[PDB]
């Protein structure tokens, strides 16, 4: 039987590392133009939750907009649920040049980590931690068949293998899908059974797509169909 997991709040505990990343981002352009208001916790979450954004560059550009405008409160409560950078684009007549906000973005995430790096800094992805104990993956890959879905990229997947301290050898990183789309999954188990391991609604709706196209399978969501991934193995290990 396959176990399937999610990476970000299911193996690692992604400590707001990427909220963190944005936040110093934005406020890096933000000190460029003089500007020392702080981007609050709260607009980056929200604008990432209601918004489509590409990713949290783009995520960073329309914050470092709406923060120059001095009305970043209201322009997040306007912005359109589904929005992406265009309507940012759109309504004040600029963008990013380049890749100014990736560049600065990743110096931030990545630290050492990134070989083209603006300057020298302790990456904040060295702030996530394991949620996973190592010698549960150790003990279910005896008996089960071990993979992960997530859109982290295969560079970001080594990191997440070096927090841990396990190598997963069957993995779909964003090169290749993205959930929700369920081609992700059947890439994976191709129609042998098992259960993915989720902590969001993208994660459910993502097995539900799976069922509607390929086939039965499980799905489970930690915080609510369990409490935690660990729980969620030794149930499977204790019982099957
Ligand atoms: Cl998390
Ligand atoms: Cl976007
Ligand atoms: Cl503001
Ligand atoms: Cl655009
Ligand atoms: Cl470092
Ligand atoms: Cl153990
Ligand atoms: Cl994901
Ligand atoms: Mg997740
Ligand atoms: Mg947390
Ligand atoms: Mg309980």
């Not at 702080?38 to 918004?51: A, D, Q, S």
């Not at 783009?58 to 405008?69: G, R």
């Not at 603006?118 to 060295?126: I, R, S, V, Y």
Request: proline share 3%.
């Amino acid at each position: 039987m396959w176990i399937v997991f999610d990476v970000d709040g299911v193996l690692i505990d992604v400590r707001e590392s990427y909220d963190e990343a944005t936040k110093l981002t934005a406020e890096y352009f933000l000190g460029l133009f003089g500007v020392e208001r702080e981007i609050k916790p709260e607009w980056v979450r929200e604008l990432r939750r209601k918004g489509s954004f590409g990713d949290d560059f783009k995520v960073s550009e329309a914050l470092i907009l709406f923060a120059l405008s001095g009305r970043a409160e209201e322009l997040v409560e306007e912005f359109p649920e589904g929005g992406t950078i265009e309507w940012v684009r759109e309504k004040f007549g600029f963008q990013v040049f380049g890749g100014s906000i990736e560049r600065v973005f990743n110096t931030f995430y990545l630290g050492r980590e990134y070989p083209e790096r603006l300057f020298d800094f302790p990456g904040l992805w060295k702030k996530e931690r394991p949620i996973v104990r190592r010698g549960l993956l150790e003990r279910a890959s005896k008996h089960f068949k071990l993979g992960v879905v997530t859109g982290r990229s295969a560079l970001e997947m080594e990191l997440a293998e070096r927090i841990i301290g396990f190598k997963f050898e069957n993995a779909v990183t964003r090169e290749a899908y993205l959930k929700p789309d369920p081609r992700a999954l059947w890439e994976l188990v191709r129609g042998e059974p098992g259960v993915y391991i989720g902590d969001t609604i993208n994660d459910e709706l993502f097995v539900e797509n799976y069922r509607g196209k390929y086939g039965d399978f499980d799905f489970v969501m930690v915080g609510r169909d369990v409490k935690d991934v660990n729980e969620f193995l030794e149930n499977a290990l204790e019982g099957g």
